[PDB]
Amino acid sequence: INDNRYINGINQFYFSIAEGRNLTLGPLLNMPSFIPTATTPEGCTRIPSFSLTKTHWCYTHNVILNGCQDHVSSNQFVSMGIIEPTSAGFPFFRTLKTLYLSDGVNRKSCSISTVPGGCMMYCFVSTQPERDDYFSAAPPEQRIIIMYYNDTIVERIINPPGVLDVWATLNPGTGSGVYYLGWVLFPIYGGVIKGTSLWNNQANKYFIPQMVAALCSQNQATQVQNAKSSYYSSWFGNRMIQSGILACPLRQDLTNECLVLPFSNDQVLMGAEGRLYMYGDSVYYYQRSNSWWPMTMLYKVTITFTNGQPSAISAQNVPTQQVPRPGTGDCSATNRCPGFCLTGVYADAWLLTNPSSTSTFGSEATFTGSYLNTATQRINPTMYIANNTQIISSQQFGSSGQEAAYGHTTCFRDTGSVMVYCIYIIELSSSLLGQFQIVPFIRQVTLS
Amino acid sequence: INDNRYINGINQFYFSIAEGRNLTLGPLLNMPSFIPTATTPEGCTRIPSFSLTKTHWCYTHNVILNGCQDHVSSNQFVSMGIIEPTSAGFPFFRTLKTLYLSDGVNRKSCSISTVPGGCMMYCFVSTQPERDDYFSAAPPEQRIIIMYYNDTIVERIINPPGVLDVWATLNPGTGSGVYYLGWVLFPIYGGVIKGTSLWNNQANKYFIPQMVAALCSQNQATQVQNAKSSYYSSWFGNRMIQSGILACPLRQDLTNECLVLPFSNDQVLMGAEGRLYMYGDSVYYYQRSNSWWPMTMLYKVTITFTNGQPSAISAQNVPTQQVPRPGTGDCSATNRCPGFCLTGVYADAWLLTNPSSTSTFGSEATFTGSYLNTATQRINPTMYIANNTQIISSQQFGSSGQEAAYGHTTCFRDTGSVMVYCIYIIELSSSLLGQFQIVPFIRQVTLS
Amino acid sequence: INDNRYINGINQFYFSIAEGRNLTLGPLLNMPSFIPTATTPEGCTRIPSFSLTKTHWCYTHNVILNGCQDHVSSNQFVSMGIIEPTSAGFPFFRTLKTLYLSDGVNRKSCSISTVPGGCMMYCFVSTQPERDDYFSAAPPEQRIIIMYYNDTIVERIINPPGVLDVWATLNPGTGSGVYYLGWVLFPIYGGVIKGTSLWNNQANKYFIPQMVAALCSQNQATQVQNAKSSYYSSWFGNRMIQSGILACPLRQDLTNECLVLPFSNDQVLMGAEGRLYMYGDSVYYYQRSNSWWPMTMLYKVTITFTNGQPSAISAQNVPTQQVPRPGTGDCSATNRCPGFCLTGVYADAWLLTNPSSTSTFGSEATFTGSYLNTATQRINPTMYIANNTQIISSQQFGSSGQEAAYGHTTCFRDTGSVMVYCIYIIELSSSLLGQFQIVPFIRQVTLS
Amino acid sequence: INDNRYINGINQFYFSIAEGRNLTLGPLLNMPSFIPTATTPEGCTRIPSFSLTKTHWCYTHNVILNGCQDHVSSNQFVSMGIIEPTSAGFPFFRTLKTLYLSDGVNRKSCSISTVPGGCMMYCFVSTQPERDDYFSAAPPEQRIIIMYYNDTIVERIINPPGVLDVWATLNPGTGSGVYYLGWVLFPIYGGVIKGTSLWNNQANKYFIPQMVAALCSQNQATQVQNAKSSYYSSWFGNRMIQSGILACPLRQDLTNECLVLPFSNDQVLMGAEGRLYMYGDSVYYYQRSNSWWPMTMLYKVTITFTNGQPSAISAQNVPTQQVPRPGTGDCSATNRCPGFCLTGVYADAWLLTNPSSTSTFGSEATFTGSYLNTATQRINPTMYIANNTQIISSQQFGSSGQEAAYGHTTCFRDTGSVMVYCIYIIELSSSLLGQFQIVPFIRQVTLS
Ligand SMILES: *[C@@H]1O[C@H](CO)[C@@H](O[C@@H]2O[C@H](CO)[C@@H](O)[C@H](O)[C@H]2NC(C)=O)[C@H](O)[C@H]1NC(C)=O
Ligand SMILES: *[C@@H]1O[C@H](CO)[C@@H](O[C@@H]2O[C@H](CO)[C@@H](O)[C@H](O)[C@H]2NC(C)=O)[C@H](O)[C@H]1NC(C)=O
Ligand SMILES: *[C@@H]1O[C@H](CO)[C@@H](O[C@@H]2O[C@H](CO)[C@@H](O)[C@H](O)[C@H]2NC(C)=O)[C@H](O)[C@H]1NC(C)=O
Ligand SMILES: *[C@@H]1O[C@H](CO)[C@@H](O[C@@H]2O[C@H](CO)[C@@H](O)[C@H](O)[C@H]2NC(C)=O)[C@H](O)[C@H]1NC(C)=O
Ligand SMILES: *[C@@H]1O[C@H](CO)[C@@H](O[C@@H]2O[C@H](CO)[C@@H](O)[C@H](O)[C@H]2NC(C)=O)[C@H](O)[C@H]1NC(C)=O
Ligand SMILES: *[C@@H]1O[C@H](CO)[C@@H](O[C@@H]2O[C@H](CO)[C@@H](O)[C@H](O)[C@H]2NC(C)=O)[C@H](O)[C@H]1NC(C)=O
Ligand SMILES: *[C@@H]1O[C@H](CO)[C@@H](O[C@@H]2O[C@H](CO)[C@@H](O)[C@H](O)[C@H]2NC(C)=O)[C@H](O)[C@H]1NC(C)=O
Ligand SMILES: *[C@H]1O[C@H](CO)[C@@H](O)[C@H](O)[C@H]1NC(C)=O
Ligand SMILES: *[C@H]1O[C@H](CO)[C@@H](O)[C@H](O)[C@H]1NC(C)=O
Ligand SMILES: *[C@H]1O[C@H](CO)[C@@H](O)[C@H](O)[C@H]1NC(C)=O
Ligand SMILES: *[C@H]1O[C@H](CO)[C@@H](O)[C@H](O)[C@H]1NC(C)=O
Ligand SMILES: [Ca+2]
Ligand SMILES: [Ca+2]
Ligand SMILES: [Ca+2]
Ligand SMILES: [Ca+2]
């Protein structure tokens, strides 16, 4: 279990609106990395997922032996432990168990989540190029693995209702899932088949960020038309790219009890990887901007239960125009107009301030994370702190040109020294060992 | 506990003299590294120690926050686990516990050793520059820490007899120690004070490798004179630099039961870092060439017990002229003549063949490890396989100019697939994160 | 252990009814304070708890680094020792052990109690403003820590039955607890949820001090109506503010063996901080007047055991109209009429005379303590001796305007010189170091 | 025993000459004070002594019940404990034992010193006004008390040789003593009788600080004449006011084994209170400027042993002109010319840099402490850091006019966080409780 210095500083809004204005990033602190490195030049470690909770943390990432492309073989590294203070005062993520799922099953796009006494991981089994998954009417196999700290492992092949013949594909969003009211929730996305109820109920729906108008040159009518079309991809088997949540009851005999809950396309953008968070009793969702809007997307999710079962989800977006992401073509970090896009990067963000603390939801929100500072390339990884309109603190890592990919940010407070530490897990392109080196950078978020 | 595939392939001579002739290094295999990385550009991780045994393995290294020089602050990372096969067939070092001794005590030059149910680590507490330790008549504080897999930790400040007023300094050799007949043996070295019994008994003693004559241009008389003098250092407080073994009975209340057993300078070269090995029932010793002879030094150690206590050690050197080490001045990799030197690097070697299997001890010995291929710089790390006179297989890592430091090599056999794997733990100078990146390279040693 | 001069003069009624009439406060005596001072101008030390017993005494208070408001960080200072005579004849509280619980867990409103061989402390973990605790249906975490004189420390998170889903919050009364018949009893208070058994059983109950009629201008019917309503607070999440006792068996593995025993609202006023005393074999309770009645509240508690377990408590009030406390609005020291109030200060009182010694319980009771002599401000700290209707001896400390807060009074007798000493622990507002300076004033209570 | 974070950061020079130039005082940190407060307005706590060592610390001060003048009654408070880190990272002086010597013996001017397993305190028994001690040919009674942590107390009346009929009076310097090579050394001072060997051997000797010339307007001849005369006081019974060291072997049966070692008046100024320090293996002495030179006086003391017994002491002054002290008349902080003076205050200083590290002893020395910033009054207590000529960092405490008296400064390093903390024990005049409040201020000495 985590040290007494952290058990009460996890999953919360750490600063008041007033304090968010005077926040800044401290120097990077040096701790023993708890994320394993490749031991060959071409070894590839990518797609991390990290979950932290009151009692412990869970970590995982995919390992491919040669290069980063392979749809036949890969192993999945899983790790878990606690946080404890060092004599310098800052955190040390102590690993208490390690696992390396290496058995021939190609588990991909895995999302992990802390659960009482262990970790629950959700993956899909890849047997062909991603694009082929969207064309095949059959969805990939889905699996959720529970790894207890007592070393018991239970893996199940799940078949949630409304997936077969509805979704051509279904993937975990790779971002962490969360344990909420006895259920484990995972972010999901994929492509829905034309003519299905979902498709029909989703018909004519679209979402446009509050701050697009002022920045977009097209008129309202044109925007609405392009927005509606951005949810359908001809390149990906002509499917409606949908975002959603997978809810699984915490059981060791899961089969078809997990529920697929898709977001209304009236509240969310085109489906993409994502991450679920927990701030107090509130669930939040991060959605990768793989569509036309290149800015960070965060939503407060309201979950409805009917007979003790999640029955519907509603998402309220925190309006911002800050922290863009590198895209391709007419969907670079400079784009502001609706249209169909299918490019981007995963770069979640952590809210240091409560969006509900302002009379108008998210009118003044502060968040932190990392982003690739460039219009179209995955270059210049930069850690930052920002509000809805501007970046108020930032520090690029390495020299310009430095390649990087995804970034997962998590913050917690030391209730002992009363300081907030954030960990920025960034996939860095390395020249020495392996294609990438997933690094858990850690630094303090100073008030002043 | 280790997988059934390894419990019977540990600490042995894996090949016959005939087979050693046809051995070669396979490609480097990619596994999740079990050695933690620094998370800042200037963070320094150095001086690793690794012990593997039938049941499990122990690992540790020193961590300094800024740069690699600091005689006030450092933390020591400890790790332990087992070996298990992956679906590709090769090993995966599974970490089952992690520890980060961070409390203000500056533990340095630590040597670690596997023990039933945990690890035993030996360190000395550094409070001043190394050179100052040799000038001060008082030896640094010595400590042995026992870390059980059940998470109990017992640390003791030891005061073995014959240290106070005999040794001005005393350090663990950083190389792994071994668990032999109920005792934990650690390699040690340091400086002895003039006029002490040890000094007197050591007087006029010297050792000259069997293969020096043919390579040295000085006459026998001149060599013997220079050799005798190479054991005394005016730069290091005018002490006799001595090598030896620290024997501690496996107890949780250690005080003065550990015994300091110095090697006869008639059988070993000037004191230096070292490592102890176990091949079957035989103990072996590796001695860093920090003196005039720049070639790999291995010895079969014969331990004598008197009343259930180690009473004396004898060392028989495996005569070789292979695998040189970068030195400074007239002590570069090209030196062959006796004289006083105090330069070099730690680069142990693993014997793949039994030296006692030949009518004349070590007449045809094969070993493997890594070395820095250059005369005076710590550059061009190269993994190899060699016999007494030549390198019969080798592969440099990275491009020329690549900086590196120490190298610890360990081999074991997969009794399942019947292949030998060796792990080469090399301190690599990295440009991205940290001063060094200690990498556990792993590859197979192929017969053919 | 305490000196022979005090082991037989602890926890008793020291004077007879006749003697109480001729009692007076001697001069303040100067002894080395055993309560630690802050070392910064804004450092805050508040909320002390003190327990004295035949063998020794226990002391504790909360420390906040900046100012007196913080619901994230605080440390708790614990101290313990004995009493021994000085050459001047008066007491000296000799500290034999000190502890500073500083680890990130925000322990608040702690109550301490002497136990054979150490101290037992009860605290709740604060993670948000007090008011928020009443609105949240979940109660704060509860903990009891046992600190043995032999330096062993055992802390447990307790979950007594009937708390979850019954009490929205639960706090220790900060006043000392007591060790009675093998159990440790602590005063508690908090808010109960509407619709719960407790709430229902407590419905329509109210208590009115015997001496209110003669001083209140409202008629009996109006008083009863207002009294009934004074137990419910809309400002504090619409909960029934309840007072009670927490009974814990003296064990090192406490979990859910502690029992919550609430007082009947027919015998006690609205819940508030409190303190438990021991006079001979009788347990007494002090209840802070945080409601409409501004006078000192003391009750003789009768505890019922069923199968060796505390099963119910009954409280009999010592009727008085003396020693008022500063309040706010229509609840100042001058108020005498029932109604809902939520203002006041902690100012316990020590009974120098037995209330059961008169044909009519408490018809002539004498007590001592300190109080803030003003109607609405926390000003003019004054030590006194009083009977039910009047203050028969008193001495204000400092000049008018002097700020102060809580006051804990404890008396004991020197069986050697046959004099009674009382210690008045008062939180004094200081101008030099720290927000407050908790001072253990000590003086004799003279007969004549 | 002290925490592992401090056992290796005690009694040393913490910074290099280069680093001393960039040092500054951090904010005052708030910790629970370990120095007891008075509990009456006129109670007087004065003359503290503090000793810190690798294993623990010792503290003591005098307590007079009414006012600060009394030569009949006083008690002496003794305290001892260890240092341990708090969750905020800074020190907490944990008291593990307390003692209050209250028995009628008027122990005064006590100096305390850490010793293996306890404290050794040296006091003299006062039975009359100080001035009368100088006129009486008989010296006051001398006593050394040893207080073991195991609660054994041994007090002895010592009669060292060469005191009776040589010294009219003899007092401990109140500053801490030190445990050196098996002996406890205490600073002493007093008045020597005319015609005694000491007096004669001391005849015509005088000392003039290296930096007086440049600041004094008198010529060399005049200075030497006035300097010689400054060692004799007609007001104090016409005695030679001498400074020195009392060396006692660590024994429980001390009688006349302690040795009085006076300083040569050719190396030290007129006798005064003082303190002994230990920096590594070197002993240092602080001498109160109770004479004409108003600046901080520090000396490196070289102790000579003859047959295992201290036989002579030599003192080398660290030349400075910084940190003056309030004096009276022609001896205020502005005085620079030799002459007879008998005014001043105790204000020791801690060397943060080694004086022997410069080619010319003390050419660039940095020290810290507190001083009363005013020419003649004991007002404006100010903590500072200074070099030989200037104050490079300082912060006055309280508002101008604030009265204070003595100041004892001690620094140590946290080898964990690598920061230096200094504790400044200052006697502050308080308006609330007691004449003075001896406060242990603590703050960090930052490099940058
Ligand atoms: C490790 O912990 C898990 C968590 O409880 C144990 O799981 C139980 O497994 C049994 C059957 O194997 C089920 O009937 C229980 O319902 C499970 N407990 C619950 C409710 O989670 C698991 O058995 C533990 N490992 C072992 C066997 O020691
Ligand atoms: C985000 O932060 C920026 C910078 O801190 C805010 O912009 C400042 O707004 C104030 C007025 O409130 C101006 O006085 C400053 O000049 C602005 N800074 C500059 C020059 O950019 C911005 O208001 C914040 N956005 C919000 C409200 O979320
Ligand atoms: C973890 O394993 C060790 C290894 O045995 C246990 O050590 C024993 O400790 C007790 C006292 O603590 C000794 O009296 C025994 O002799 C030790 N066993 C031996 C011979 O090694 C240790 O106690 C275990 N941890 C716990 C307490 O569960
Ligand atoms: C070490 O290995 C080398 C190379 O394998 C051995 O040298 C060979 O020796 C054979 C005779 O036994 C010759 O026929 C080859 O021509 C040699 N190789 C060359 C060209 O270098 C060497 O003998 C081995 N050293 C020993 C005996 O340990
Ligand atoms: C509390 O103390 C007061 C004062 O000591 C008592 O009042 C006195 O009562 C006697 C009669 O018993 C009168 O002769 C005095 O004149 C009263 N003193 C004055 C002038 O106030 C009072 O009776 C006591 N209250 C009780 C009975 O507890
Ligand atoms: C507390 O510790 C001291 C320190 O040793 C003990 O002192 C010993 O006392 C005996 C006689 O009382 C002497 O003969 C020894 O020489 C002392 N030890 C030394 C060398 O310091 C003391 O006895 C201890 N308290 C007790 C009695 O438990
Ligand atoms: C003590 O500190 C002062 C201030 O840091 C030193 O004075 C500075 O000396 C440098 C040259 O070495 C000048 O460039 C600065 O202008 C000086 N500061 C000022 C304006 O006072 C002083 O030299 C130090 N004394 C020593 C050498 O111990
Ligand atoms: C933050 O800093 C600004 C500028 O120094 C200051 O005025 C403001 O009060 C601070 N805000 C808070 C409440 O921390
Ligand atoms: C090794 O290889 C050589 C050359 O192919 C072969 O002649 C020899 O028999 C082999 N040695 C053994 C016994 O493995
Ligand atoms: C107390 O004092 C009164 C007045 O001097 C005296 O009459 C009375 O007897 C005393 N009471 C007792 C019993 O102490
Ligand atoms: C101290 O600070 C000065 C000014 O910033 C800098 O130039 C100097 O290098 C520092 N000195 C050291 C060695 O700390
Ligand atoms: Ca498909
Ligand atoms: Ca030494
Ligand atoms: Ca609540
Ligand atoms: Ca005298």
From Swiss-Prot, chains A, B, C, D:
One cellular component (GO) term of this entry: membrane
EC number: 3.2.1.18
Keyword Membrane: yes
Keywords: Disulfide bond, Glycoprotein, Hemagglutinin, Host cell membrane, Host membrane, Host-virus interaction, Hydrolase, Membrane, Signal-anchor, Transmembrane, Transmembrane helix, Viral attachment to host cell, Viral envelope protein, Virion, Virus entry into host cell
BP term (GO), one: virion attachment to host cell
Carbohydrate-modified residues: N22, N150, N387
Listed name of the protein: Hemagglutinin-neuraminidase
Organism: Parainfluenza virus 5 (strain W3)
Residue window of the full protein shown: 118 to 565 of 565
